[PDB]
Amino acid sequence: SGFRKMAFPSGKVEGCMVQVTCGTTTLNGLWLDDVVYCPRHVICTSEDMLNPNYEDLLIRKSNHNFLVQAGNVQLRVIGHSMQNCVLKLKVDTANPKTPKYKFVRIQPGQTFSVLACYNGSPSGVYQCAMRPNFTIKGSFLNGSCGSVGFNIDYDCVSFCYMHHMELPTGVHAGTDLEGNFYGPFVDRQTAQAAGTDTTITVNVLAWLYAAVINGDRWFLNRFTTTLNDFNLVAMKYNYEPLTQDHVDILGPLSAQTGIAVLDMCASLKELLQNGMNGRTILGSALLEDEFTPFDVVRQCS
Amino acid sequence: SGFRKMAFPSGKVEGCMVQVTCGTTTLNGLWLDDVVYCPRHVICTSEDMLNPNYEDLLIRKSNHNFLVQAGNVQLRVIGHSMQNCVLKLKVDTANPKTPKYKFVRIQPGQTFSVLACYNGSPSGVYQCAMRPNFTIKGSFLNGSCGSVGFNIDYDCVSFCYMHHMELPTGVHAGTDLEGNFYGPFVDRQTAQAAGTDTTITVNVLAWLYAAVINGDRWFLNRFTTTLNDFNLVAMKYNYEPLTQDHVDILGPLSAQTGIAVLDMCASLKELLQNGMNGRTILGSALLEDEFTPFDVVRQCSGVTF
Numbered sequence: 161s162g163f164r165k166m167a168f169p170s171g172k173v174e175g176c177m178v179q180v181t182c183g184t185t186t187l188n189g190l191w192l193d194d195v196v197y198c199p200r201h202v203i204c205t206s207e208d209m210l211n212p213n214y215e216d217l218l219i220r221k222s223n224h225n226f227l228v229q230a231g232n233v234q235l236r237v238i239g240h241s242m243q244n245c246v247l248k249l250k251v252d253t254a255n256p257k258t259p260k261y262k263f264v265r266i267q268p269g270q271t272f273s274v275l276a277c278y279n280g281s282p283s284g285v286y287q288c289a290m291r292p293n294f295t296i297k298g299s300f301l302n303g304s305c306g307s308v309g310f311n312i313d314y315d316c317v318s319f320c321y322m323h324h325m326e327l328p329t330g331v332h333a334g335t336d337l338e339g340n341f342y343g344p345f346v347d348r349q350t351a352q353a354a355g356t357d358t359t360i361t362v363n364v365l366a367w368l369y370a371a372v373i374n375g376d377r378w379f380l381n382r383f384t385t386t387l388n389d390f391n392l393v394a395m396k397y398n399y400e401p402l403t404q405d406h407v408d409i410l411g412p413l414s415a416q417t418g419i420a421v422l423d424m425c426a427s428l429k430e431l432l433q434n435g436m437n438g439r440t441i442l443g444s445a446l447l448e449d450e451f452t453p454f455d456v457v458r459q460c461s
Numbered sequence: 462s463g464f465r466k467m468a469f470p471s472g473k474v475e476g477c478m479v480q481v482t483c484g485t486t487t488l489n490g491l492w493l494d495d496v497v498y499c500p501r502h503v504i505c506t507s508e509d510m511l512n513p514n515y516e517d518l519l520i521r522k523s524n525h526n527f528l529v530q531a532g533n534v535q536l537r538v539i540g541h542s543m544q545n546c547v548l549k550l551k552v553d554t555a556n557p558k559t560p561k562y563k564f565v566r567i568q569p570g571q572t573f574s575v576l577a578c579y580n581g582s583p584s585g586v587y588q589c590a591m592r593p594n595f596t597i598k599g600s601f602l603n604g605s606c607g608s609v610g611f612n613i614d615y616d617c618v619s620f621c622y623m624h625h626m627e628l629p630t631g632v633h634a635g636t637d638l639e640g641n642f643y644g645p646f647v648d649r650q651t652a653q654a655a656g657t658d659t660t661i662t663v664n665v666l667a668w669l670y671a672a673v674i675n676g677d678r679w680f681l682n683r684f685t686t687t688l689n690d691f692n693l694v695a696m697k698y699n700y701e702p703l704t705q706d707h708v709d710i711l712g713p714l715s716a717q718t719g720i721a722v723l724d725m726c727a728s729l730k731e732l733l734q735n736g737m738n739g740r741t742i743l744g745s746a747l748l749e750d751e752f753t754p755f756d757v758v759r760q761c762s763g764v765t766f
């Protein structure tokens with residue numbers, strides 16, 4: 161029993177964090193086998209990146225300009241290449257702590273753990289979701305660039321995010337481990353703004369099912385709804401549309417609790433109309449949207 | 462920017478988790494040097510949990526009855542002893558992954574990270590607080606017994622909790638690493654209930670300072686109060702008393718934000734008497750009490766391990 165925001169154990173990722181220094185810029189790198197991955201803006205200064213030409217700046221660099229530190233050991237860079245917004249530094253030592261891993265690109269609404277690092281040293285671990293506007297609401301300071309997001313489903317680490325920047329609203333933007341940004345963002349100091357954010361509807365429903373599994377039923381009602389009537393109400397509260405894919409995904413939780421998805425959808429409509437009235441659900445006074453249907457099944461069952 | 466519930470990196474603890482099996486019971490153990498620590502209820506069966514004489518049950522056990530597994534390697538137990546509600550299994554091999562560590566007993570209001578395990582395998586990490594009623598609002602299923610709570614100071618792991626049981630309300634009870642329970646609980650199947658809980662006042666104040674650091678100021682006011690007038694109001698709302706020690710602990714955050722502790726207390730007083738009025742603080746509609754003043758400074762300064 162109980163429901164907590166839970167991160168994956170960070171040990172397999174801690175053994176991969178290194179510090180990458182180029183000129184006056186220092187950030188974090190991910191050391192896997194004989195390659196260190198890091199944001200390409202490590203080659204810029206603060207005045208170089210209103211409009212940086214990364215191909216032009218990288219060609220002027222030599223292997224000995226990149227200082228890589230793993231613990232109190234300096235690694236030797238023997239090659240460098242760029243793949244989209246990530247820099248790949250080939251090193252002369254394979255990381256002996258390299259876990260079984262994959263690079264996966266996630267979709268909005270998906271969750272992952274973040275290992276926040278400064279100077280190649282892990283400082284904390286927390287749980288995050290890729291917002292529908294492709295930003296993440298992280299907790300990051302100056303020097304966190306290169307910190308990674310990941311999931312550990314059975315022995316293998318799936319790296320899904322690398323931190324690159326903070327937008328003016330305090331939210332964060334980054335790329336997958338192939339250097340492709342999530343969202344319409346660029347690794348430039350140019351004026352960029354996160355689009356209006358929306359609530360991850362399928363995740364809220366999964367979390368209402370988690371509350372029923374934990375014995376909370378106060379918010380349930382005798383109503384059902386059509387999927388279209390639900391979406392018409394949902395859009396009015398800045399909630400993401402719920403597709404038939406989401407309804408199918410919620411099937412196992414529906415079968416376990418005995419409550420049809422469209423029945424839970426009618427409870428959600430009622431909560432949005434009434435509020436909580438001094439009550440809480442799983443210790444929260446707001447509807448939580450950073451637990452996926454897969455997270456709920458894993459934590460509850 | 463941003464404020465998250467953040468746990469310590471769990472790597473130093475992951476290298477210590479093992480599976481302990483005794484008869485039909487399987488739970489987790491903490492392998493440090495040549496000793497495996499686990500809840501003493503691992504030796505219990507049916508009526509052994511209802512009315513247990515643990516000295517009597519342990520004397521009947523032999524070293525080979527305890528199966529300890531570290532990864533896909535079976536460890537051999539060469540001795541066994543009991544210290545309060547913890548069983549100590551002496552093994553032939555010192556854990557090569559043993560970090561620098563200490564056993565510390567924490568006070569209510571203090572926070573720690575929990576590495577939830579099943580079958581000696583870490584499955585999740587979360588940050589939580591020792592409630593004033595000595596329970597933890599954790600997230601644990603069958604098989605989680607022996608999961609540990611810890612903090613990190615520099616490169617030293619301070620183990621402060623070992624999970625033993627779940628109470629009928631869904632809250633959790635356990636011991637320090639010396640086997641002494643937190644709270645008025647016993648390790649047996651019997652009627653036990655958590656006492657009425659209270660809010661950790663000093664932690665709420667620390668979290669209001671974290672919100673100010675992140676640009677959330679709507680709740681601030683021109684007012685200040687006395688520690689005695691605040692404690693009168695606090696008692697009325699099931700809030701823990703705020704001592705001069707807490708006021709001193711909040712000093713650095715007070716200096717950084719320019720909001721004196723008794724000034725932040727007047728803001729907290731109005732929040733209790735009037736509510737949030739549809740507004741949120743750090744994305745929450747409730748006052749959060751599981752971040753200590755040290756947690757707030759650590760996260761709003763980027764201390765690493």
Ligand SMILES: *CCC(=O)N(C(=O)[C@@H]1COc2ccc(Cl)cc21)c1cncc2ccccc12
Nearest residue numbers: 300301302303304305324325326347348349462
């Ligand atoms: C790694 C720290 C850092 O430089 N951060 C940035 O956002 C930089 C500054 O301006 C930028 C524009 C574009 C890019 Cl791709 C990168 C940066 C950074 C990252 N995460 C959180 C931060 C919080 C405060 C200050 C800087 C932060």
Ligand SMILES: *CCC(=O)N(C(=O)[C@@H]1COc2ccc(Cl)cc21)c1cncc2ccccc12
Nearest residue numbers: 161502601602603604605606626627648649650
């Ligand atoms: C390790 C699993 C376990 O046995 N749990 C208990 O709470 C047991 C059952 O009854 C008990 C009475 C006294 C003690 Cl000392 C231990 C137990 C366990 C632990 N944590 C969470 C659980 C959730 C669901 C079921 C069992 C749980």
